[PDB]
Scaffold this active site. Structure first.
Site, PDB file in Angstrom:
ATOM      1  N   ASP H  58       0.830  -1.196   0.000  1.00 11.49           N
ATOM      2  CA  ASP H  58       0.000   0.000   0.000  1.00 11.49           C
ATOM      3  C   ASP H  58       0.868   1.251   0.000  1.00 11.49           C
ATOM      4  OD1 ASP H  58      -2.054  -1.796   0.043  1.00 11.49           O
ATOM      5  OD2 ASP H  58      -2.971  -1.089   1.902  1.00 11.49           O
ATOM      6  N   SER H  59       1.923   1.217  -0.805  1.00  8.32           N
ATOM      7  CA  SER H  59       2.811   2.354  -0.979  1.00  8.32           C
ATOM      8  C   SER H  59       2.848   2.716  -2.453  1.00  8.32           C
ATOM      9  CB  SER H  59       4.214   2.050  -0.467  1.00  8.32           C
ATOM     10  OG  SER H  59       4.269   2.131   0.942  1.00  8.32           O
TER      11      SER H  59
END
Ligand SMILES: [Mg+2]
Ligand SMILES: [Zn+2]
Ligand SMILES: [Zn+2]
Ligand SMILES: [Zn+2]
Lengths: 94, 147, 117, 46, 49, 240, 95, 98, 259, 67, 156
Positions: H58-59
């Site tokens: 989730d980057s």
RNA sequence: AAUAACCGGAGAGGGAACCCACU
């Protein structure tokens, strides 16, 4: 008023005057009025072969000034404000 | 780095590191992608709607029209979109070759790319980080304040 | 709030010098050059040039951390060959290539602008 | 000493002294804003 | 007199009724605001069914 | 009443005695970084300069401690509070007379932590004992904690706005014992199921698999580039 | 406007190398000057000049007289009793 | 752009964005919300591929040139208030430079 | 053992862009030549905005931002100017900067488009690219309010901020037919013929090259209007040469210190 | 809130195109054709002028409360 | 100007010894408490450092030949307590020298006129002897810099 | 015929309930 308007227009202002006498009253008035319009950017140049000597001689003579200025001396401080101007670097004598 | 960007499918995330354009890779033309979401998100989230959106957006941008994405259409789908891609000359399934910007060598495997829509969320980082060093204390008990 | 000032990517301050050198103990005739405030603009082309010369056994470059603008090049050259002189020779060759390429582009650009007719 | 405020609906400049009713001199409006500062300001384009 | 009762914006007695985009922009209120909330003590409050 | 003042979670027994507030504990969002090892964690300059660590003045380092003290506050590597042996507490945030800046052995210096310092680093809910690990601090510019990716399995964190708390042990003996017990590599195996937990993150797992495919072939320059980063490397290329 | 005379600092009393410092008061009764005098009394290298008459029966007179024990502390540095008074000499009055 | 007259409306904790843009691909229903007139968020050419290993979970790795050219530069507001109070002469609250 | 003889040639040129080919050169040097275009090609852009009075609906910082990104003609005066942070003088001097003024007072009923043509410059050599086509928009103005500001523009380059970046778009590539097989096509039929390909209709896949290295790199640089593309490329090469010279000098001093 | 003077990804000046683009659309052209005539070939520049929303008219609609 | 030390409390007043050794009676609200510097230092004319609660002999003055514990210190005086002294609870006041042991820039717009930040206009918040914190007008950040590089543009 | 008077002498004040939102 006229000086301020011209400097705002962006021209240059020339002022003939003996390096003594009325110049000092004019300088007090301008010192009080410059901050009114916030014209600190525009510098004052005082050009004359006796400018520095005249300024210093005006500073030393305290006993001959008015009572207000003699008191300003008795409260240790140079009687005229053009000394403060020069220390602030707005006015430069050449 | 530390913000929160959320796609239109729940693919939340935080801006890991910000690269300059020169370090940022590119396709054959001067296009350089703006955001690199991780591959590993899709296989478990099953948000293929994200891929379909990215593809349709590319098609719409090339076409010059705002493509529609109504939920229950059934008149448009992957095959029609791929046909339009064949028409416009890009790859059938939206993949493209990309170039590393550090070395310059071509990326071994083609990549999926295309336009999409992002929304940066209200949870800016500046509004969360704080630290304490022997500040104030509560009145009833000699303990640090809160908030 | 903590974002590093933009110019930190290219400016060198007092107390540090652009280049530093250190000798390697693992294998003889190997040296590490640390360059401050520099990124893959040069860290690649230096290796690409040096790999040309056969007198060098190992040449490498690595950035310890991208946010920390710094690069280290470790080179182990054949005995009787000094890494310093090998490195300087590679760079001067690269400079010559670059300048002559510039001149060739200059003449080509006059040719085109005046016309290829 | 007195400050320069702006009426709002009139757009008219007016002066007000402390501990006074906040009304425009001619329409007597109640909403009163304050004028920009005279101190310099300079932004780097970044 | 009995008392005062709040009224939600864009009601059939609200000042914001019958005024088109030109009038509302003159009155410096967004013409697009859906309206349907009570203004209380300054804050803007809503009833949850 | 008093009974209401004691029974509830906010009562003195639970929310105030067992669980009570404390200082020297920063909080912020995390951000992945593979470059740095598992035992290291990055921190911002702001937190590193607002957080305090005590030091005993000794001649071995007295020169450095004075060279740091005269730097004063507001300069990242520096100390903000000096405490005399007798217990006199003199602060430097108000720039006192230079005379007091003199130092002698035995004094207390409140100096900012730099790289190498140990810090405990947890994420509630702290279910299993391995969410409370120690780490070595490192300084990085942007404002967020930075930790290696393999650490996110024991923490169950994912970087999607999950934040994480950081306490700094204050006393030196506590520092040492934390170093020797809670530092991460001393907890790779777990008592619950006698297994390794650090594991390997999803991305490096897929990368290592595709890399160690049975037919992978690689060029001289690429190999010469890859071998650079092996910290434990002997320094001799292997035979192709 | 003095180019080479600058305001004194107490902490400079320990500073090494030859120095020149004026001090107050001329009578030494309180003696901010007496502070540095006590600081340096042991050394025989330093000079001190008293350019005026001291008050009899005070530390001024004790230093005026050459005895080492002047209060019980011993003075070792060298004293020179100069006269720079700005008063009228007999010939001045007569003239 | 949460509402047209945000400049004049003085709320608390109001976020507004420099460059809203209607989404390239949408439903037909969106324009009935006026969401085309007050959009929130910006299109963004994305590339789904692990590039450097700085975007594991989730980057996302953002181009910084876009940020410098206007990519998502947002402004943030906040409004205060103060009720000067007059009391029964035991306390009188007045606005004056201390 | 020596750097090969690079060989180049332009396909065609135009004010908008320049397209050329590089032959007998390495991938790394080609990549660096590209990167210098994006990064190290200094130009003149506004960098110090002082606002006497702003009253439009765009807040001041937005106006400063927008004025930052306008492009300026910097054909050759960029060489004469010398970096502001590096020039020793009082604030800005005519050598290390350039001055712009912008005063507008919309007094007519219709909305006025404050546009780049209104930016009065001090030096004729530099002006908004639009001046010397529609104008670049700054901010719209309703009747009544005004905008008065003074701007100073200096010489920066790509790294510092992307407002100094003049290379609108660079397309870099090579081996348009994957001869080197750096990339792999599971279904090479699907992929589209590169415009620079020379393959037949049926094949559409060059044979594998057992021995070969990247060559005949293709470059397409599109200027943003600040500088002519040829000047861009020449300045890139010259600046890169300057950087290499700096490195050589510093490391020679380092060697002398070492010995 | 206004047209972004540059392409977020490329850098091509796009701000000056907006009024001409509205003129073209009022001239009864399909947006794609008019856009190509204006000369936006990549879809990383076409997007802005195709799907940009202009609110500055809405903001101007109001009166200046500051004068 | 003159501080005092309470020698006795009363129903509605306080007997206080002034600095000159005179005992007076003052109202409860007449006097006010003053901050005490518990780490102050004094000298008693023989240059050996003295502090509060230190035993010293009074060998000069009206109280010559006595001894007591230093209760309070001043710039030039000291309140000394002697148990044997019944009067005034044993407190008295004597000058220390008769005893023997037993900025301008703050709040002023300035301009970074030289250095990496040349051209910025900021405000000075903290002024040290050499450096100064400036709060820039563009960034959400504050910087440290030496006074030499400043030029108090604008300002008052 | 009079002599350095801390010379950046800095601790902070509610709280209690409710709802919202992030993990
Ligand atoms: Mg989470
Ligand atoms: Zn009015
Ligand atoms: Zn200059
Ligand atoms: Zn583009």
């Amino acid at each position: 008023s006229n000086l301020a308007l011209t400097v705002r227009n962006g021209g240059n202002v020339l002022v003939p005057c003996y390096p003594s006498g009325v110049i000092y009253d004019l300088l007090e008035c301008l010192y009080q009025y410059i901050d009114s319009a916030g014209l600190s950017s525009v510098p004052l140049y005082f050009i004359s072969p006796v400018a520095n000597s005249s300024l210093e001689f005006s500073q030393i003579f305290a006993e001959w000034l008015c009572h207000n200025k003699q008191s300003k001396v008795y409260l240790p401080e140079p009687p005229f404000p053009h000394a403060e101007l020069i220390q602030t670097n707005k006015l430069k004598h050449y | 780095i530390g913000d929160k960007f959320a796609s239109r499918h729940g693919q939340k995330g935080t801006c890991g590191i910000q690269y300059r354009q020169e370090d940022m890779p590119f396709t054959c033309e001067g296009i350089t992608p703006d955001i690199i979401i991780n591959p590993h998100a899709i296989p478990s989230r099953m948000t293929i709607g994200h891929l379909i959106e990215c593809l349709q957006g590319k098609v719409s941008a090339n076409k010059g029209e705002i493509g529609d994405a109504t939920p229950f259409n059934d008149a448009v789908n992957v095959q029609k979109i791929s046909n339009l891609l064949s028409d416009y000359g890009y790859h059938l399934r939206g993949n493209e070759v990309l170039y590393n910007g550090f070395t310059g060598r071509k990326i071994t495997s083609q990549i999926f790319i295309g336009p999409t829509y992002y929304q940066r969320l209200k949870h800016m980082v500046d509004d969360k980080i704080h630290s304490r060093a022997r500040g104030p204390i509560q009145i009833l008990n000699r303990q640090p304040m809160e908030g | 709030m903590n974002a590093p000032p933009a110019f930190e990517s290219f400016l060198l301050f007092e107390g540090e010098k652009k280049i530093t050198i250190n000798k390697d103990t693992k294998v003889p005739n190997a040296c590490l050059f640390t360059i401050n405030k520099e990124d893959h603009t040069l860290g690649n082309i230096i290796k690409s040039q040096l790999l040309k010369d056969p007198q060098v056994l190992f040449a490498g470059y690595k950035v310890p951390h991208p946010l920390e603008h710094k690069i280290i090049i470790r080179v182990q050259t054949t005995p009787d060959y000094s890494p310093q002189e090998a490195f300087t020779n590679a760079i001067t060759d690269l400079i010559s290539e670059l300048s002559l390429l510039e001149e060739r582009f200059r003449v080509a650009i006059k040719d085109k602008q005046e016309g290829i007719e | 000493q007195p400050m320069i405020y702006i009426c709002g609906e009139c757009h008219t400049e007016n002066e007000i002294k402390s501990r006074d009713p906040i009304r425009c001199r001619e329409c007597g409006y109640r909403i009163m804003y304050k004028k920009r500062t005279k101190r310099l300001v300079v932004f780097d384009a970044r | 007199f009995i008392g005062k009762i709040p009224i939600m914006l864009r009601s059939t007695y609200c000042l914001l009724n019958g005024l088109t985009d030109r009038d509302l922009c003159e009155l410096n209120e967004c013409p697009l605001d859906p309206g349907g909330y009570f203004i209380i003590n300054g804050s803007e409050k809503v009833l949850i069914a | 009443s008093l009974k209401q003042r004691l029974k509830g979670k906010e009562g003195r027994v639970r929310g105030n005695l067992m669980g009570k507030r404390v200082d020297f504990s920063a909080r912020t969002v995390i951000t992945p970084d593979p470059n740095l090892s598992i035992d290291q964690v990055g921190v911002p300059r702001s937190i590193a300069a607002n957080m305090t660590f005590a030091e005993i003045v000794t001649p071995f380092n007295i020169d450095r401690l004075q060279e740091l003290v005269r730097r004063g506050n507001s300069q990242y590597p520096g100390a903000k509070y000096i405490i005399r042996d007798n217990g006199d507490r003199i602060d430097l945030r108000f720039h006192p007379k230079p005379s007091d800046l003199h130092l002698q052995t035995g004094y207390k210096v409140e100096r900012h932590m730099c790289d190498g310092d140990i810090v405990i680093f947890n994420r509630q809910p702290t279910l299993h004992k391995m969410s409370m690990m120690g780490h070595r601090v490192r300084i990085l510019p942007w404002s967020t904690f930075r930790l290696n990716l393999s650490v996110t399995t024991p923490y169950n964190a994912d970087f999607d706005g999950d934040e994480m708390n950081l306490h700094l042990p204050q006393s030196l003996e506590t520092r040492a014992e934390i170093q020797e017990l809670a530092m991460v590599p001393r907890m790779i195996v777990t008592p619950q199921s006698n297994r390794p937990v650090m594991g390997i993150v999803q991305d490096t797992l897929t990368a290592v698999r595709k890399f160690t495919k049975r037919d992978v072939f690689l060029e001289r320059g690429e190999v010469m580039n890859l071998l650079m980063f092996l910290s434990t490397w002997d320094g001799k290329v292997p035979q192709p | 406007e003095f180019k080479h005379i600058k305001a004194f600092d107490r902490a400079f009393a320990d500073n090494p190398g030859p120095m020149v410092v004026f001090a107050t008061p001329g009578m030494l009764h309180a003696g901010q000057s007496l502070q540095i005098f006590r600081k340096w009394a042991g050394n025989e290298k330093n000079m001190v000049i008293m350019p005026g008459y001291c008050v009899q029966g005070t530390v001024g007179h004790k230093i005026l007289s050459g005895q080492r024990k002047l209060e019980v502390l011993e003075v070792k540095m060298q004293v020179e009793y100069m006269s720079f008074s700005a008063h009228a000499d007999a010939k001045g009055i007569m003239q | 752009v949460y509402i047209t007259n945000f400049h004049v409306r003085m709320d608390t904790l109001a976020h507004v964005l420099y460059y809203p843009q209607k989404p390239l691909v949408t439903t037909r229903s969106m324009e009935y919300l006026r969401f085309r007139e007050l959009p929130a968020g910006i299109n963004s050419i994305v590339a789904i591929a692990s590039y450097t290993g700085y975007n594991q979970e989730d980057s996302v790795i953002m181009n910084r040139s876009a940020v410098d050219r206007g990519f998502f530069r947002s402004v943030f507001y906040r409004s205060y208030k103060e009720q000067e109070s007059k009391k029964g002469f035991d306390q009188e609250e007045v606005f004056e430079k201390p | 053992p020596y750097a090969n003889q690079p060989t180049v040639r332009i396909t065609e040129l135009t004010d908008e862009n320049v397209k050329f080919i590089i032959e007998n050169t390495d991938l790394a040097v080609a990549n660096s030549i590209r990167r210098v275009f994006i990064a190290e090609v200094p130009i003149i852009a506004i960098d110090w905005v002082q606002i006497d009075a702003n009253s439009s609906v765009l807040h001041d910082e937005f106006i400063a931002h927008r004025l930052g990104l306008i492009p300026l003609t910097s054909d050759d005066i960029v060489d004469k100017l010398q970096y502001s942070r590096d020039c020793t003088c009082e604030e800005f001097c005519p050598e290390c900067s350039v001055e712009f003024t912008l005063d507008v007072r919309c007094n007519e009923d219709q909305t006025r488009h404050v546009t780049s043509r209104d930016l009065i410059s001090n030096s004729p050599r530099v002006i908004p690219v639009t001046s010397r086509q529609d104008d670049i928009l700054i901010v719209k103005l309703r009747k009544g309010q005004e905008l008065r500001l003074r701007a100073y523009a200096k010489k920066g380059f790509g790294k510092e901020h992307a407002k100094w970046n003049p290379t609108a778009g660079v397309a870099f590539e090579y081996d348009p037919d994957n001869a080197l097989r750096h990339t792999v096509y599971p279904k090479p039929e699907e992929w589209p013929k590169s415009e620079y390909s020379e393959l037949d209709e049926d094949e559409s896949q060059a044979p594998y090259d057992p021995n070969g290295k990247p060559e005949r790199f293709y470059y397409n640089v599109e200027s943003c209007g600040s500088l002519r593309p040829e000047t861009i490329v020449l300045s890139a090469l010259s600046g890169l040469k300057k950087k290499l010279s700096d490195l050589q000098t510093q490391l020679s001093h380092e060697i002398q210190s070492d010995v | 809130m206004i047209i972004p003077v540059r392409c977020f990804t490329c850098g091509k000046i796009v701000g000056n195109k907006w009024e001409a683009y509205l003129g073209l659309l009022q001239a009864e052209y399909t947006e794609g054709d008019a856009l190509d005539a204006l000369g936006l070939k990549r879809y990383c520049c076409r997007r802005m002028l195709l799907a940009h929303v202009d609110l500055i008219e809405k903001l101007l609609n109001y009166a200046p409360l500051e004068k | 100007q003159t501080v005092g030390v309470i020698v006795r409390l009363e129903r509605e007043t306080f007997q206080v010894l002034n600095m000159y050794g005179k005992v007076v009676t003052v109202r409860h609200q007449a006097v006010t408490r003053k901050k005490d510097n518990r780490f102050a230092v004094a000298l008693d004319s023989e240059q050996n450092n003295i502090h509060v609660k230190d035993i010293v002999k009074v060998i000069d003055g009206p109280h010559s030949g006595r001894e007591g514990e230093i209760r309070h210190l001043f710039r030039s005086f000291a309140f000394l307590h002697c148990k044997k002294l019944v009067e005034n609870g044993g407190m008295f006041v004597c000058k220390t020298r008769h005893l023997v042991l037993a900025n301008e820039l703050i709040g002023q717009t300035v301009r970074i006129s030289q250095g990496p930040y040349k051209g910025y206009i900021g405000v000075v918040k903290d002024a040290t002897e050499s450096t100064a914190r400036v709060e820039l007008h563009s960034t959400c950040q504050t910087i440290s810099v030496d006074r030499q590089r400043l030029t108090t543009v604008g300002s008052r």
